[PDB]
Design a protein around this motif. Structure first.
Motif, PDB file in Angstrom:
ATOM      1  N   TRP A  63      -7.009   3.327  -2.058  1.00  0.00           N
ATOM      2  CA  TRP A  63      -5.882   4.017  -1.466  1.00  0.00           C
ATOM      3  C   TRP A  63      -5.673   5.428  -1.997  1.00  0.00           C
ATOM      4  N   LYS A  87      -0.038  12.800   0.762  1.00  0.00           N
ATOM      5  CA  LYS A  87       1.036  13.778   0.611  1.00  0.00           C
ATOM      6  C   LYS A  87       0.844  14.552  -0.698  1.00  0.00           C
ATOM      7  N   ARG A 141      -5.265   8.685  -6.317  1.00  0.00           N
ATOM      8  CA  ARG A 141      -5.991   7.660  -5.592  1.00  0.00           C
ATOM      9  C   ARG A 141      -6.362   6.571  -6.592  1.00  0.00           C
ATOM     10  N   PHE A 180       2.410   3.573  -8.124  1.00  0.00           N
ATOM     11  CA  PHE A 180       1.737   3.152  -6.907  1.00  0.00           C
ATOM     12  C   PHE A 180       2.031   1.696  -6.626  1.00  0.00           C
ATOM     13  N   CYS A 240       4.581   9.279 -11.525  1.00  0.00           N
ATOM     14  CA  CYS A 240       3.818   8.628 -10.467  1.00  0.00           C
ATOM     15  C   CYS A 240       3.835   7.105 -10.598  1.00  0.00           C
ATOM     16  N   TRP A 245       0.786  -1.230   0.000  1.00  0.00           N
ATOM     17  CA  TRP A 245       0.000   0.000   0.000  1.00  0.00           C
ATOM     18  C   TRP A 245       0.819   1.282   0.000  1.00  0.00           C
ATOM     19  N   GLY A 246       0.834   1.963  -1.141  1.00  0.00           N
ATOM     20  CA  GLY A 246       1.562   3.215  -1.246  1.00  0.00           C
ATOM     21  C   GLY A 246       1.544   3.841  -2.626  1.00  0.00           C
ATOM     22  N   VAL A 247       1.860   5.133  -2.674  1.00  0.00           N
ATOM     23  CA  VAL A 247       1.926   5.897  -3.927  1.00  0.00           C
ATOM     24  C   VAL A 247       3.227   6.691  -3.914  1.00  0.00           C
ATOM     25  N   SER A 248       3.890   6.779  -5.060  1.00  0.00           N
ATOM     26  CA  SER A 248       5.137   7.525  -5.134  1.00  0.00           C
ATOM     27  C   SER A 248       5.125   8.614  -6.201  1.00  0.00           C
ATOM     28  N   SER A 249       5.261   9.864  -5.766  1.00  0.00           N
ATOM     29  CA  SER A 249       5.307  11.007  -6.678  1.00  0.00           C
ATOM     30  C   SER A 249       6.058  12.158  -6.000  1.00  0.00           C
ATOM     31  N   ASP A 302      -3.268   8.917  -1.702  1.00  0.00           N
ATOM     32  CA  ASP A 302      -1.969   9.405  -1.292  1.00  0.00           C
ATOM     33  C   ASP A 302      -2.262  10.736  -0.611  1.00  0.00           C
ATOM     34  N   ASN A 330      -3.415  15.093  -5.882  1.00  0.00           N
ATOM     35  CA  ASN A 330      -3.345  13.838  -5.144  1.00  0.00           C
ATOM     36  C   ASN A 330      -3.880  12.698  -5.975  1.00  0.00           C
TER      37      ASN A 330
END
Length: 118
Positions: A106, A110, A97, A24, A22, A2-6, A108, A95
């Motif tokens: 999920w 941030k 999702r 995820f 991005c 579970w996570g997102v990266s950007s 994100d 953001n």
């Protein structure tokens, strides 16, 4: 899992396009037998305007209709957002999702901050 990266920050210039990299991630043990829904929000805490919606493009705010595209390969964990013809107003937080199946969604919290320079 579970996570997102950007990127926390991204700068761009008026008229030009922009690409927010991005990617995820989520637990392999989760069934994704119905595809994933990608959703890009603009100013989630405030207006919360929908920039992208793979599920139903009818939900996209007009502010962004036609000037946003999702250049990702869902089946590759990629959720790259491309904003066409940047504008000063387009500055703010975006953001991402994704939804796999109700109990499996999920957001994100941030997000990425876009600053549209001169």
């Amino acid at each position: 899992t579970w996570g997102v990266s950007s990127p926390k920050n991204v700068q761009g210039l008026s008229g030009s396009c922009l690409l927010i990299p991005c990617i995820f991630s989520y637990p392999a043990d989760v069934p994704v037998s119905n595809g994933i829904t990608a959703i890009w929000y603009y100013d989630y805490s405030g207006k919360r305007q929908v920039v992208i919606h793979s599920g139903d493009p009818k939900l996209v705010d007009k502010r962004f209709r036609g000037r946003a595209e999702l250049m990702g390969n869902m089946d590759h964990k990629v959720c790259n957002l491309l904003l066409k013809d940047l504008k000063p107003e387009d500055s703010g937080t975006y953001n991402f999702r994704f939804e796999i199946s109700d109990s499996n969604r999920w957001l994100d919290v941030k997000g990425t901050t876009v600053t549209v320079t001169t």
